[PDB]
Amino acid sequence: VTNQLQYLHKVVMKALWKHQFAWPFRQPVDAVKLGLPDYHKIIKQPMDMGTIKRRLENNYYWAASECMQDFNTMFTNCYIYNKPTDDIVLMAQTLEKIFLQKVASMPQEEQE
Amino acid sequence: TNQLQYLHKVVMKALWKHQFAWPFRQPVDAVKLGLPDYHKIIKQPMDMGTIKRRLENNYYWAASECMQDFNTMFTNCYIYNKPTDDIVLMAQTLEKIFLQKVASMPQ
Ligand SMILES: CC(=O)N1c2ccccc2CC[C@@H]1C
Ligand SMILES: CC(=O)N1c2ccccc2CC[C@@H]1C
């Protein structure tokens, strides 16, 4: 438990989890359900806000930057795999802007 | 602001001198690269040279605005290029550093 991780849980995750574009991101991409047999050939580290939220709730992370990298991986996976014109990309872009806006006000020094 | 000074002198300086940074220091030249669909796909081009100039001319009102530009630069890369292109790996490496440095930005 640190100040920055607390910020990431109470402010960042909170804002993103409840967002109207969040639903595709709340649980891992299900390649069988979506009919996407190449998903795991292209994305090697899948990530989603369910996993991140669980990690925050279970004090999995040692540094804020580790949680931040998971958010970033989640978004990057989306941009890499999907077509440029897919709606999911716009949804990801919207959530990521909120992520960055919030991260701009995160406590600067990690103190346990 | 203090934050924009940090993005200029600590964050951008670190990214700029990185060994994977050269493709990102100026706008994508679609003519020179022979990529006639680049601008049909990427509608908001961005690069660190534009960001640096914006930091130097007091263009940004807040740190958040400048962070969005970095993000757009990286997202453009992921969206346009093939998943297996080296440039994607290069962007990912630089993006990690960006976020690492951003976490220590003055509040
Ligand atoms: C989050 C994501 O990238 N996807 C996703 C995840 C859940 C629901 C729909 C979609 C659209 C396709 C794509 C594989
Ligand atoms: C930065 C970037 O995305 N590109 C770029 C920019 C400069 C030099 C090479 C490359 C590889 C293709 C791609 C269009």
State the smallest CA–CA distance between residue A25 and chain B in angstroms. Answer: 17
Structure obtained using = X-ray
Task: Give residues (CB < 6 A) around ligand 1.
Answer: A 24-25, 29, 34, 36, 78, 81-82, 88
8 Å CB contact between B64 and B105: no
Which residue, among B17, B26, B71, B21, has the nearest Cα to B47 in the 3D structure? Answer: B26
Q: How many CB atoms lie within 10 A of CB B50?
A: 16
Whether ligand 2 lies within 6 angstroms of the CB of B45 is answered as no
Q: How far is CA A17 from the centre of its chain?
A: 9
Sign of CA pseudo-dihedral A107, B1, B4, B8? negative
Domain A1-112 annotated CATH 2.60.40.10: no
Whole-angstrom Cα distance, residue A21 to residue A14? 14
Architecture per CATH, domain B1-107, reads as Up-down Bundle (1.20)
Whole-angstrom Cα distance, residue A66 to residue B103? 10
Whole-angstrom Cα distance, residue B93 to residue B99? 10
- Determine if residue A38 is labeled as part of a ligand binding site: yes
Whole-angstrom Cα distance, residue A72 to residue A84? 18
| Residue B87: Cβ-neighbour burial (10 angstroms; 0-12, 13-18, 19+) | middle
Which residue, among B75, B64, B78, has the nearest Cα to A103 in the 3D structure? Answer: B64
8 Å CB contact between B11 and B100: no
- H/E run at residue B70: helix B63-80
A97 and B68 within 8 Å at the Cβ level: the answer is yes
- Tell me the resolution in Å: 2.0
Helices (H), chain A: 3-7, 14-17, 31-34, 39-42, 49-57, 64-81, 87-103
Among candidates A79, A97, A107 on the partner chain, residue whose Cβ is nearest the Cβ of B107: A107
